[PDB]
Amino acid sequence: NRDMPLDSDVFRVPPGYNAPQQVHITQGDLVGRAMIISWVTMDEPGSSAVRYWSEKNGRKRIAKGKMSTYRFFNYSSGFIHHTTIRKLKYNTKYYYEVGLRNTTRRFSFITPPQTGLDVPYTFGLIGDLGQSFDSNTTLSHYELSPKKGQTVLFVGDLSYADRYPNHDNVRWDTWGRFTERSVAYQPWIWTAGNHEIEFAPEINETEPFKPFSYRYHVPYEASQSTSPFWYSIKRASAHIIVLSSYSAYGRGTPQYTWLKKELRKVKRSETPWLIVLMHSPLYNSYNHHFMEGEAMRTKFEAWFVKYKVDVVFAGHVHAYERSERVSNIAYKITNGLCTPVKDQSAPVYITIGDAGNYGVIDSNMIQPQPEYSAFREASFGHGMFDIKNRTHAHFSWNRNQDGVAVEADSVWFFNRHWYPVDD
Amino acid sequence: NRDMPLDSDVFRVPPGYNAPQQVHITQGDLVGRAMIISWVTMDEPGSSAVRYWSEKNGRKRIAKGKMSTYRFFNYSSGFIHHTTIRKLKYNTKYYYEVGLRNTTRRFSFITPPQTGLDVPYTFGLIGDLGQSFDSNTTLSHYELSPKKGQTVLFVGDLSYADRYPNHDNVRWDTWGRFTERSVAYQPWIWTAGNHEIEFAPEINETEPFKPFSYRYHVPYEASQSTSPFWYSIKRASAHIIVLSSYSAYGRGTPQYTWLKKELRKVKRSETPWLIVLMHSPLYNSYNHHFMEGEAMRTKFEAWFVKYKVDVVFAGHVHAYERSERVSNIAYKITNGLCTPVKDQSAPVYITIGDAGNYGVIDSNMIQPQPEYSAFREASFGHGMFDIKNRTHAHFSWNRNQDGVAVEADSVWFFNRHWYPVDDST
Amino acid sequence: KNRDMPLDSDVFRVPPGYNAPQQVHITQGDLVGRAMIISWVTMDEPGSSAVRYWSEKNGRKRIAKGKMSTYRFFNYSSGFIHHTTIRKLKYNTKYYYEVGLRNTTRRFSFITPPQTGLDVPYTFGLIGDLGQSFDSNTTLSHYELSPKKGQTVLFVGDLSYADRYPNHDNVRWDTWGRFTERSVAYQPWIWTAGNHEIEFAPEINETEPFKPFSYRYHVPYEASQSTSPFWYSIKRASAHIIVLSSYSAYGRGTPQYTWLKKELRKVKRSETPWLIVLMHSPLYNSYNHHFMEGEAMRTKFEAWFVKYKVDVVFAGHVHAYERSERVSNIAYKITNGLCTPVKDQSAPVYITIGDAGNYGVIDSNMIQPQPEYSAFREASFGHGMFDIKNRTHAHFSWNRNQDGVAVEADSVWFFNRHWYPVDDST
Amino acid sequence: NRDMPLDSDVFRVPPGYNAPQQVHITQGDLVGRAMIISWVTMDEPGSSAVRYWSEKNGRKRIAKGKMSTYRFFNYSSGFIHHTTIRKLKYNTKYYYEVGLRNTTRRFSFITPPQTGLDVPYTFGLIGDLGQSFDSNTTLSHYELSPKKGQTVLFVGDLSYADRYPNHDNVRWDTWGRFTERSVAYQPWIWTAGNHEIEFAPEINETEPFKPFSYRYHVPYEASQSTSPFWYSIKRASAHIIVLSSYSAYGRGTPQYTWLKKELRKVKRSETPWLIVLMHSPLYNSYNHHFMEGEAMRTKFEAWFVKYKVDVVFAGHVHAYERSERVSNIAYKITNGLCTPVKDQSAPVYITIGDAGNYGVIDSNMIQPQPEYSAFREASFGHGMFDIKNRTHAHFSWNRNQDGVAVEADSVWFFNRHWYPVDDS
Ligand SMILES: *[C@@H]1O[C@H](CO)[C@@H](O[C@@H]2O[C@H](CO)[C@@H](O[C@@H]3O[C@H](CO)[C@@H](O)[C@H](O[C@@H]4O[C@H](CO)[C@@H](O)[C@H](O)[C@@H]4O)[C@@H]3O)[C@H](O)[C@H]2NC(C)=O)[C@H](O)[C@H]1NC(C)=O
Ligand SMILES: *[C@@H]1O[C@H](CO)[C@@H](O[C@@H]2O[C@H](CO)[C@@H](O[C@@H]3O[C@H](CO)[C@@H](O[C@@H]4O[C@H](CO)[C@@H](O)[C@H](O)[C@@H]4O)[C@H](O)[C@@H]3O)[C@H](O)[C@H]2NC(C)=O)[C@H](O)[C@H]1NC(C)=O
Ligand SMILES: *[C@@H]1O[C@H](CO)[C@@H](O[C@@H]2O[C@H](CO)[C@@H](O[C@@H]3O[C@H](CO)[C@@H](O)[C@H](O)[C@@H]3O)[C@H](O)[C@H]2NC(C)=O)[C@H](O)[C@H]1NC(C)=O
Ligand SMILES: *[C@@H]1O[C@H](CO)[C@@H](O[C@@H]2O[C@H](CO)[C@@H](O[C@@H]3O[C@H](CO)[C@@H](O)[C@H](O)[C@@H]3O)[C@H](O)[C@H]2NC(C)=O)[C@H](O)[C@H]1NC(C)=O
Ligand SMILES: *[C@@H]1O[C@H](CO)[C@@H](O[C@@H]2O[C@H](CO)[C@@H](O)[C@H](O)[C@H]2NC(C)=O)[C@H](O[C@@H]2O[C@@H](C)[C@@H](O)[C@@H](O)[C@@H]2O)[C@H]1NC(C)=O
Ligand SMILES: Nc1ncnc2c1ncn2[C@@H]1O[C@H](COP(=O)(O)OP(=O)(O)NP(=O)(O)O)[C@@H](O)[C@H]1O
Ligand SMILES: *[C@@H]1O[C@H](CO)[C@@H](O[C@@H]2O[C@H](CO)[C@@H](O)[C@H](O)[C@H]2NC(C)=O)[C@H](O)[C@H]1NC(C)=O
Ligand SMILES: *[C@@H]1O[C@H](CO)[C@@H](O[C@@H]2O[C@H](CO)[C@@H](O)[C@H](O)[C@H]2NC(C)=O)[C@H](O)[C@H]1NC(C)=O
Ligand SMILES: *[C@@H]1O[C@H](CO)[C@@H](O)[C@H](O)[C@H]1NC(C)=O
Ligand SMILES: *[C@@H]1O[C@H](CO)[C@@H](O)[C@H](O)[C@H]1NC(C)=O
Ligand SMILES: [Fe+3]
Ligand SMILES: [Fe+3]
Ligand SMILES: [Fe+3]
Ligand SMILES: [Fe+3]
Ligand code: NA
Ligand code: NA
Ligand code: NA
Ligand SMILES: [Zn+2]
Ligand SMILES: [Zn+2]
Ligand SMILES: [Zn+2]
Ligand SMILES: [Zn+2]
């Protein structure tokens, strides 16, 4: 047992009567002009209003949202608030206050620049965080990093509350306050991992993504999606596609129908970097969860190659891996073409679900290291995808046992649309 | 277009005010002592009470049920009725009446025998029925069959209403009146196909399976399921498992979680025959929907072989095909072990989605016929799985263009747990 | 005896065109008069709930976003019902609005009121118990033809009488929406719930009180911080209007009772000098039909009305006409014998105005003799007019269906209780 | 002031993991063959199944029920259970059990006899109970009465939890655990009082009767009512009609409509005793809530006389009053007839809301005692309506300052339908 105890300093309750805790934000619209603020109040429902104003302008405005609550087995939640601030300006710092009529707390965020071809952005990559001491040091190596992350693409598995007796949802609240120091100030883009299914019918809890969906909203209707568990956002020069590994994706299902139609919406002249987020990797040579992503691979891989996805980011496997550019899309049951071959139109598959979880690393790998695999290692850490312009983006992996400025693995992503060089 | 016109005789409306229509029955519990009675009233809600009595004794009792309505875009449904009759006795003819308050109508069913190893039973196999003239021929061939089926395992794609403008749900209503002359007297076992999804966000009909799940209910709680789209039923000497090709089946999901624990519950020494139903086939050498069943095969194929399923029935492809007993469960990305090999531990895969649909057949086969494909032919028709004892089952395939008693293909099934011997033709 | 207009009447014709909006009606959507609820129904498919609206002055076309709802009643299924609120309008300007923007649109207009003030003149038409007989149609023709300009209808309950038809056949709600649209699409009607909107029919498994009416006709009840749509307050021009529900609870401690006790405290007679109460069931009524039915709510609310010097209480329910004297009956205490209404110049005038048509029957039988609290009564179909001249004066007038559209069978000058409490008896 | 502390013994938590608490039963159907078993589990949801059996047969049954929860402002309830036991034998002792998965608890009840003309039965009448020490004293006098109550007709106002900051619904839990020692073995027939309204729009709790209606169920569908707040049951020789004082009752409203039909359905030839329960008294000569009962009386009083109601019970006034058979139904606005008169066809109106509340008795009476008032006294206590046969019922009032066997007031009821004799 390596999760931080309940009295740990990261879980300290903010002082004040009905003081907002678990404050977290993510993108509110498709293009970054909106932001959705979320927080929990414990002592009474409280106001869902959010006071915000820009850094040097100070015209204080108010946005109204909605309160909701949920129960899980024995656990009754605090009063959860979700509020969307809209029509914000690009490249502008804002302040926002929350808990307006009782104990107010103020936070900050900087909206991204407007969607554009040559607009740089620094995305952090954090996967399978949990709330162990390893979870805390990874969040630390991230906030201290010289390259300065502006949004965290989170590839799934958040709290691991479901590891506790009856999924002790108090450990949802503790994870909420723990991550607040990062997610209250810059957006985290949510994808749903297996530890968010929380399908526990043996305690009459049979509705999937029950607590995760109540606590973490995404702007899924902005991309015409009919579920929060797959959606799309555009930010700076990135077009980001988030899939649900544990929702349906057969032919005709909504997510399948949505992804087919969203792919051909992508405009690489406006967003050169096509980034796909999912939880379970389609390419992974570790023994843990080996070949689990094969089902989705049969359904979606040829579309990734068809639309030249730059990179696919997954978690689930508690280690780090980086494939070569390969595709396994020629198999026809009896023709023998069942081996991945080098394909300059294929994405790079990176597994970055090594932020700590409950404190265990996946170290047993299939040996020998297959040819489709570039780099792999079982160490805790996080990733950084730093878009420079339309042709270059520098990815880097930071180990938890290294200094915050040390890159144990780094590659130049050459854009599949504007600069498809061998990499 | 080849669908029967609206004023066809198999579409006409039962006479009398608020006369029940679209009456269908299905097994209402795990072991076959219950039945779900389902019908619709068009003129007013009416009673959901069901009067029933055995022909032998004959004390007439009432079952209290539930009624529901729904809307699909600019369509408003009539009044759907669902009522479960329980504590029935085995191997007994029962009469039952609906429309008790105005226009009553009488039908009957025969409860199956109690489950035992050697209990014989005839299952009809229908898939992708629709409401074409081809569909009517198949229904007629099934009910004139000399081997007399006692239950229809239906492997998906029912009315094809989703092909009419705005999915004109009136063609759900017509399909109920059409298929009533069979499913009102014997239970059909329902699988959700791809034409039941009806995900239509352009007219904000985004709740998958909404019309199908309103009209056709299913005893999914009896097997501890949390969804109607996957469940199990025991009936005579068989254990049937119905799966949802178009629901989540990833590791850790409800259907995935439900299936692996249901397979552990199967006692072959009590139900010898293990049958699995899905809409999209895992083995399919027809070009239509080629390799669509791969994503499920990657997850469930090894389970079918380890628990030694007897037969997997599917549709989706609008033709017939019987497979050899093969498995493809040794693939490891880089090892090249990706060809189906003979496997006497594996089930036989039958595609049986040639009941008629909207009148087109799938004849573009991948050539040459692959080694995993025993028999295939592009003809409309149905199939029959005839269980004799714990060891033998006779599967035959009847064509619409042949006589009702002619079998153009037949294979004797050796039970995987009681007669583990090669049964290839 | 069946005096209801047949369905092929010209008042019931369907607006042509694929999914033409119909049953278009408007009512105030705020407290002060800067908002409009635009209500309509589409029969062919859902369609857009969006309203295009602009003023004849500026001309800027803006869009308001609304909400789509449907309902069933027995074997009836409704069309696609739309409610959209237009907000932040300018006062005293004429607005055009368009609805049905995705296929065939239809244009109407309204004139927002002046904003509330002490001497703002305004004309209120008074229609009750309308229904859809031919008599109903003569009344609506007369109000439209009135020489002085009715700017808003205050409706004191009982709209379509669809509940008289077998299974309440709510085709007769659609019929009524189309029938009245010719007036309510261009000036707001302020709705009161009557007994015919209850539609409590357990014998056909239909136990939701007020449902068809509540789905089709919305009110700005949250603007007055009311918890229910059946009691609410609005302010228009120099008038503060309090709509009560005769067929909801009103015991001490109930929401209606609680809400009303507080709402009187908010009245500002120096902003809205005219204090108007609407309720379906009359507290004063000397007809045999529904005699003394108002006695229960009179015991709870009469004293408050007098305490706050209410100017008038308009009611329907009785299918005829009556205007009370300024009387009160608030001194009863079981054993003190004081159960006679007395002259009370602080009390409102009670006017019964439920004679617009209904299913075509008048309530002609009366309590004899005419009691002292009754100042004028007649069993005639007609409609009324409350024309505010200023803070001291307001002219009420009753007009019969059998007279010229300018002939006032009854007419009285209302002297304002807060600003000019002169005796204004018959 | 006088509300019993949380550490009191009446509020103690039954021991054991997830032990059922606040157990309380009530008539489950129209005739007495059913019983609604209700309890709250605090540690986890638990099973809503009830295991029951009769002493005559001792064959144990399982009855499945429902589970529910609610929030109120800033309070989150435990897991409320409601299960209906049916087709019970008449006049039979049944044992029932709750908490079947972890901590099991066992209780017992005796079903009433089949409804009949001369079937005796002894009802207790508690009103405005509360949580004070005066409340515990009334409950003691009830359970110690040599007359032995068999069911409680409770004329409303249960916990008074709405007198606490934001109605602190922990005070509903305590009241549940305190009244259990009577209501777990004996059915209480629930009337809704004004302290159940809990209309607190300022903390966005605007659903009237929310905490009450979740915690206490009534067989209101058995008499074709569409609302828990008005309903009727038959029990032994009594037809009992429960009315909702704080709901709509205008002409055409549901409760008005339901009451109109229900009085026409009374068969005095089988249940000759016509009992009506409301919270607000139609007859009251006390200062407190004087004349508040007027509105409903102007609506329902003539019906009560026309159908020969035997007695109407009410609380709300924290005292005791017994009216004469009196009527005030001749008023026609201008005829001056607004003075109650003797009327042997009218019911007796009793105020019995003196069970304790929060400990404040309503002492101030209007003087002198009007003619319609036969007896009145401001003392804490309870009442008993003891049916002997179709002819006779002996009502008696017990004061908490007297012994448990002393009747400070008592009177013999002659049945209005079967014995229209002056019962002065
Ligand atoms: C419905 O219920 C009524 C009250 O419960 C009942 O009226 C009572 O009837 C009893 C008789 O059962 C009355 O008691 C008798 O009255 C005189 C009074 O002095 C006594 O002498 C008499 O002595 C008894 O005599 C019996 C032999 O004849 C024998 O049991 C003993 O000797 C015993 O001492 C009784 O005590 C009582 O006063 C009545 N109460 C009233 C009128 O309030 C109704 O009759 C009953 N209806 C029926 C039974 O149909
Ligand atoms: C389980 O059930 C299966 C049923 O498919 C059994 O396998 C079948 O067994 C039957 C015999 O019961 C056999 O058919 C018979 O072949 C006989 C050849 O002589 C013919 O019978 C003749 O006609 C008369 C009727 O029995 C009789 O009077 C006469 O003496 C003569 O025998 C006739 O052709 C029968 O149909 C099938 O060939 C066989 N099917 C196979 C092997 O696939 C199986 O044996 C049963 N198991 C147990 C333990 O009972
Ligand atoms: C549900 O919506 C569909 C789609 O609108 C309705 O079908 C359509 O109904 C119209 C009648 O209003 C049909 O009219 C066609 O259009 C021209 C006008 O340009 C008309 O003059 C022609 O005679 C022609 O028929 C249209 O064909 C039809 N479309 C279909 C059936 O695909 C349908 O009636 C609605 N159903 C319900 C139950 O509301
Ligand atoms: C509340 O009740 C449930 C069931 O009524 C308790 O759990 C059940 O009981 C035991 C564990 O308590 C589980 O199996 C048993 O293990 C014990 C060893 O402790 C042994 O004697 C037997 O071999 C027996 O199989 C059982 O699976 C379990 N079931 C479930 C669904 O939990 C539960 O512990 C109770 N909670 C408490 C007391 O807090
Ligand atoms: C996009 O960013 C890349 C990295 O920032 C550019 O490549 C780098 O440019 C540096 C000049 O600032 C140079 O020293 C590096 O050698 C070079 N290559 C690296 C870091 O791998 C990239 O391309 C450059 O841009 C133009 C203006 C010229 O300098 C070229 O010679 C370079 O290739 C940038 N591309 C664009 C379109 O901005
Ligand atoms: N007509 C009236 N007669 C007496 N008191 C009245 C009357 N109208 C209003 N009141 C007030 O209502 C208050 C009653 O307190 P209240 O909260 O309404 O119920 P309560 O005192 O708790 N009695 P109860 O409802 O049985 O618990 C009294 O103290 C009076 O000030
Ligand atoms: C939710 O229910 C659980 C039961 O599983 C409670 O945890 C147990 O409580 C009992 C006594 O209350 C202890 O003996 C156990 O050791 C506890 N832990 C277990 C069983 O893992 C828990 O307290 C409840 N939570 C809330 C918020 O009420
Ligand atoms: C309020 O309006 C009334 C009615 O219009 C005014 O009284 C009238 O005053 C005019 C003079 O302009 C006279 O000719 C009429 O005879 C009056 N009518 C009546 C019925 O007396 C009154 O002056 C106005 N009060 C104001 C403006 O304060
Ligand atoms: C988590 O890390 C921060 C530094 O990043 C430290 O201040 C804090 O005490 C740590 N909390 C733990 C280890 O519980
Ligand atoms: C209704 O009223 C109008 C008068 O404005 C008229 O056009 C119509 O013919 C009248 N009668 C009927 C039956 O519609
Ligand atoms: Fe993980
Ligand atoms: Fe098909
Ligand atoms: Fe009327
Ligand atoms: Fe009280
Ligand atoms: Na996975
Ligand atoms: Na077919
Ligand atoms: Na309360
Ligand atoms: Zn995972
Ligand atoms: Zn298909
Ligand atoms: Zn009326
Ligand atoms: Zn009270």
User: Do residues A355 and A297 both lie within one domain?
Assistant: yes
- Decide: B130 and B172 in contact? Cβ < 8 Å: no
Helix (H) or strand (E) holding B410: strand B409-414
What single DSSP character describes residue A401? T
Give the integer Cα–Cα distance in Å for C56 and A405. Answer: 65
User: Do residues C91 and C155 both lie within one domain?
Assistant: no
* Residue D44 sits at the chain A interface (C-beta within 8 Å): yes
Q: How far is CA D378 from CA D159, D314, D404, in A?
A: 21, 15, 18
Pocket of ligand 10 contains residue C237 by CB under 6 Å: no
Taken in order A147, A151, A157, A162, is the CA torsion positive or negative?
A: positive
Tell whether D286 is covered by a domain. Answer: yes
User: Do residues B245 and B377 both lie within one domain?
Assistant: yes
Q: In Å, how far is B198's CA from the nearest CA of chain C?
A: 18
User: Do residues C107 and C127 both lie within one domain?
Assistant: no
Contacts of C81 in chain B (CB under 8 A): none
Contacts of A340 in chain B (CB under 8 A): 333-334
D393 CA from centroid of ligand 1 (Å): 14
Give the integer Cα–Cα distance in Å for A223 and A31. Answer: 10
User: Do residues B351 and B239 both lie within one domain?
Assistant: yes
User: Do residues A105 and A137 both lie within one domain?
Assistant: no
Q: How far is CA D54 from CA C145, D29, D47, D49, in A?
A: 78, 18, 22, 17
Give the integer Cα–Cα distance in Å for A133 and C270. Answer: 68
Pocket of ligand 6 contains residue D333 by CB under 6 Å: no
Residue whose CA lies nearest to ligand 4 atom number 2: D102
Tokens of A161: 């509350």
Q: In Å, how far is A146's CA from the nearest CA of chain B?
A: 38
Starting at the earlier edge strand, list the strands of the sheet with B392-399: B188-190, B151-154, B121-126, B381-387, B392-399, B409-414
Report the candidate in A35, A41, A90 with the shortest Cα–Cα distance to residue A63. Answer: A35
* Domain edge (last residue) among A115, A135, A166: A115
Residues in chain A: 423
Contacts of C227 in chain D (CB under 8 A): 199, 201, 206
Give the integer Cα–Cα distance in Å for B376 and B354. Answer: 12
Instruction: Kindly give the pairing relationship between strand C122-127 and strand C152-155.
Output: parallel
* Domain edge (last residue) among D93, D115, D137: D115
Q: Give the CATH number of the domain where residue C53 resides.
A: 2.60.40.380
- Decide: D340 and D328 in contact? Cβ < 8 Å: yes
Tell whether C9 is covered by a domain. Answer: no
Written as one letter, the residue type at C213 is: F
Contacts of C72 in chain B (CB under 8 A): 69, 76
Contacts of D210 in chain C (CB under 8 A): none
Report the candidate in A29, A86, A17, A4 with the shortest Cα–Cα distance to residue A233. Answer: A29
Q: How far is CA A47 from CA A13, A43, A86, B359, D73, in A?
A: 19, 12, 18, 60, 13
Point out the ligand 2 atom lying closest to the alpha carbon of residue B389: 1
Give the integer Cα–Cα distance in Å for C297 and C285. Answer: 13
Catalytic residue numbers of C, as ranges: 290
Q: Give the CATH number of the domain where residue D169 resides.
A: 3.60.21.10
Pocket of ligand 7 contains residue D17 by CB under 6 Å: yes
Tell whether D3 is covered by a domain. Answer: no
Give the integer Cα–Cα distance in Å for C16 and C34. Answer: 32
Catalytic residue among D195, D217, D289, D417: D289
Contacts of C75 in chain B (CB under 8 A): 43-45, 79
Give the integer Cα–Cα distance in Å for D48 and D59. Answer: 20
Size of interface A-D (CB pairs under 8 A): 17
* Domain edge (last residue) among B115, B141, B168: B115
Q: Which of C22, C41, C44 maximizes ligand 3 atoms within 8 Å of its Cβ, making it the mutation to test the pocket?
A: C44
User: Do residues A109 and A145 both lie within one domain?
Assistant: no
Resolution limit in angstroms? 2.6
- Decide: B237 and B390 in contact? Cβ < 8 Å: yes
Tell whether D4 is covered by a domain. Answer: no
Q: How far apart are the first and last CA of chain A?
A: 41
Give the integer Cα–Cα distance in Å for D260 and D251. Answer: 10
Tell whether A109 is covered by a domain. Answer: yes
Report the candidate in D8, D10, D45, D36 with the shortest Cα–Cα distance to residue D233. Answer: D36
Neighbouring residues of the ion ligand 11, judged by CB less than 5 Å: A 128, 157, 357
DSSP per position, A63-127? E--EEE--EETTEE--EEEEEEE-SPPTT-EEEEEES-SSS-EEEEEEPPPPS-TT--EEEEEE-
Cis peptide before A113 (omega within 30 of 0): no
D135 CA from centroid of ligand 14 (Å): 12
User: Do residues C94 and C121 both lie within one domain?
Assistant: no
User: Do residues A85 and A167 both lie within one domain?
Assistant: no
Give the integer Cα–Cα distance in Å for C81 and C23. Answer: 9
Contacts of C238 (CB under 8 A, 6+ apart): C116, C117, C118, C119, C120, C121, C122, C272, C273, C274, C388, C390, C391
* Residue D367 sits at the chain A interface (C-beta within 8 Å): no
- Tell me which residue in D245, D332, D339 faces C251 most closely, judged by beta carbons: D245
Give the integer Cα–Cα distance in Å for D398 and D406. Answer: 6
Tell whether C11 is covered by a domain. Answer: no
Residue whose CA lies nearest to ligand 8 atom number 21: C393
Find out whether D417 is annotated in a ligand binding site.
no
User: Do residues C373 and C257 both lie within one domain?
Assistant: yes
C-alpha angle B35-B39-B40 in degrees, rounded to nearest 5: 160
Closest-CA residue of chain B to C205? B45
Residue whose CA lies nearest to ligand 3 atom number 21: C18
Tell whether A97 is covered by a domain. Answer: yes
Instruction: Write b or e for each residue in D186-211: b if 16 or more Cβ atoms lie within 10 A of its Cβ, otherwise e.
Output: bbbbbbbbbbbbbbeeeeebeebbbb
Q: What region, left, alpha or beta, does residue A221 occupy, with left being phi > 0 and alpha being psi -120 to 50 degrees?
A: alpha
* Residue B45 sits at the chain C interface (C-beta within 8 Å): yes
Give the integer Cα–Cα distance in Å for A314 and A125. Answer: 10
* Residue A249 sits at the chain B interface (C-beta within 8 Å): yes
Q: In Å, how far is D298's CA from the nearest CA of chain C?
A: 6
Tell whether C46 is covered by a domain. Answer: yes
Q: Does chain D touch chain B (at least 3 C-beta pairs within 8 Å)? A: no
* Residue D295 sits at the chain C interface (C-beta within 8 Å): yes
* Residue B68 sits at the chain C interface (C-beta within 8 Å): no
- Decide: D179 and D356 in contact? Cβ < 8 Å: no
Closest-CA residue of chain B to A330? B291
D417 an active-site residue? no
Tally DSSP H helices, then E strands, for chain C.
6, 25
CA dihedral D232, D233, D238, D240 (to 10 degrees): -30
User: Do residues A197 and A224 both lie within one domain?
Assistant: yes
**Phi, psi at A301, each rounded to 5°:** -65, -45
**Interchain CB distance below 8 Å, A252 and B194:** yes
Count Cα atoms within 13 angstroms, Cβ side, for D125.
29
Give the integer Cα–Cα distance in Å for B166 and C90. Answer: 42
Report the candidate in B328, B284, B285 with the shortest Cα–Cα distance to residue B304. Answer: B328
* Residue A197 sits at the chain B interface (C-beta within 8 Å): yes
Written as one letter, the residue type at C336 is: N
B interface test, pick of A251, A332, A365 with most B CB neighbours within 10 Å: A251
DSSP per position, B218-286? --GGGGT-SSTTSEEEEETTEEEEE--TTS--STTSHHHHHHHHHHHH--TTTS-EEEEE-SS-S---B
Contacts of A285 in chain B (CB under 8 A): 333
Pocket of ligand 4 contains residue D267 by CB under 6 Å: no
Which method was it determined by? X-ray
In the three-class reduction of DSSP (H, G, I as helix; E, B as strand; rest coil), residue B174 is classed as: helix
**Interchain CB distance below 8 Å, C254 and D197:** yes
Give the integer Cα–Cα distance in Å for B124 and B122. Answer: 7
C-alpha angle A401-A404-A407 in degrees, rounded to nearest 5: 80
A75 CA from centroid of ligand 5 (Å): 55
Find out whether C319 is annotated in a ligand binding site.
yes
What single DSSP character describes residue A44? S
B interface test, pick of A334, A335, A369 with most B CB neighbours within 10 Å: A334
Tokens of B138: 């198949």
Instruction: Kindly give the pairing relationship between strand C274-278 and strand C312-315.
Output: parallel
Q: How many domains does chain B have?
A: 2
Q: Which residues pair with A322 in a beta bridge?
A: A350, A375
Q: Which residues pair with A376 in a beta bridge?
A: A321
* Residue D197 sits at the chain C interface (C-beta within 8 Å): yes
The residue ranges of DSSP E strands in B90-216, in sequence order, are 93-98, 105-110, 121-126, 151-154, 188-190
User: Do residues C52 and C199 both lie within one domain?
Assistant: no
**Interchain CB distance below 8 Å, B71 and C70:** yes
Q: Alpha helix locations (H) across D129-249?
A: 133-143, 170-183, 210-215
* Residue B69 sits at the chain C interface (C-beta within 8 Å): yes
CA dihedral A411, A412, A418, A421 (to 10 degrees): -80
Give the integer Cα–Cα distance in Å for C164 and C197. Answer: 11
Report the candidate in C152, C113, C92, C137 with the shortest Cα–Cα distance to residue C314. Answer: C152
Catalytic residue among B195, B289, B382, B394: B289
> Rounded to 5, what percent of chain A is helix, strand, coil?
15, 30, 55
Neighbouring residues of the ion ligand 16, judged by CB less than 5 Å: B 128, 318, 353-355, 357
D244 CA from centroid of ligand 3 (Å): 51
Range(s) of the domain holding residue B389:
116-425
Q: In 10 A of CB A15, how many CB atoms?
A: 8
Give the integer Cα–Cα distance in Å for D275 and A75. Answer: 45
Point out the ligand 4 atom lying closest to the alpha carbon of residue D43: 39
Q: How far apart are the first and last CA of chain B?
A: 38
Tokens of B214: 């309103």
